[PDB]
Write a protein that binds this ligand. Structure first.
Ligand code: MET
Length: 239
């Protein structure tokens, strides 16, 4: 009666953290992990919904709340494990002030993350968000440039085409990039609601096993693994 759990995860940090747990902690907890790596945001929630995964570990609390609102998903989430500060990246400039007149900024296409990237740009004086649904058509541009919506896994590649791109940590990681080494502008980690959580479906038969994985993901061992593995500011424990 060891329970096996199929968990979907983006490769870095999430699959790495899950692999540390699998290889170091799962056996003592009486669980086995079957890690499935995913490279986009749509697919792990669909697989959790449709019955292919027991849990996923890739998404932020605000993205989850939006997915439940837009799609009706019946999911349950755990405590914040870690934060990935959002960054503005570029291969053409080292300062956002060098945004050419009619220049371009790549921006993700999902609601929650486009909204978060738009806020980050507001802290830099580049867009104005009305007080009160935040997207490229509802913000006011305060300098002359164009946004270009790009699908998440195309963000790092879009740096070849555009002056800048706003890029979530998991994608920056895939592209060999770090916050310390490569972010032009770094989202503040203070009072940041975009913590990453374990998500499972409300009716799982495996809730004893998933509560064990939740406890392992918020252990001192996992915090130390995160702090040892990422000291470049790209992945910060949220506990
Ligand atoms: C799928 S919501 C964004 C998740 C991403 N790993 C982040 O923390 O920004």
């Amino acid at each position: 009666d060891v329970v096996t759990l199929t968990v979907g995860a983006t490769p870095s940090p999430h699959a790495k953290i899950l692999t540390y747990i699998n290889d170091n902690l799962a056996a003592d907890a009486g669980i086995k992990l079957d890690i499935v790596e995913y490279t986009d945001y749509v697919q792990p929630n669909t697989a959790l919904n449709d019955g292919d995964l027991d849990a996923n570990f890739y998404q932020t609390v605000p993205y989850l709340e939006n997915a439940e609102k837009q799609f009706g998903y019946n999911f349950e989430a755990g405590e914040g494990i870690h934060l990935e500060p959002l960054g503005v990246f570029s291969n053409k400039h080292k300062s956002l002030d060098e945004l050419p007149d009619g220049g371009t900024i790549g921006i993700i296409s999902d609601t929650a993350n486009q909204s978060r990237a738009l806020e980050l740009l507001a802290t830099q004086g580049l867009v104005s968000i009305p007080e009160g649904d935040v997207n490229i058509n509802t913000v006011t541009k305060l300098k002359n440039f164009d946004f270009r919506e790009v699908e998440g896994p195309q963000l790092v590649r879009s740096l070849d085409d555009f002056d800048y791109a706003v890029i979530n940590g998991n994608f920056a990681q895939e592209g060999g990039k770090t916050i310390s080494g490569d972010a032009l502008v770094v989202e503040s980690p203070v009072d940041n609601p975009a913590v990453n959580v374990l998500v499972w479906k409300g009716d799982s038969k495996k809730v004893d096993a998933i509560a064990k994985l939740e406890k392992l993901l918020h252990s001192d061992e996992v915090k130390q693994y995160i702090e040892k593995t990422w000291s470049d500011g790209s992945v910060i424990p949220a506990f």
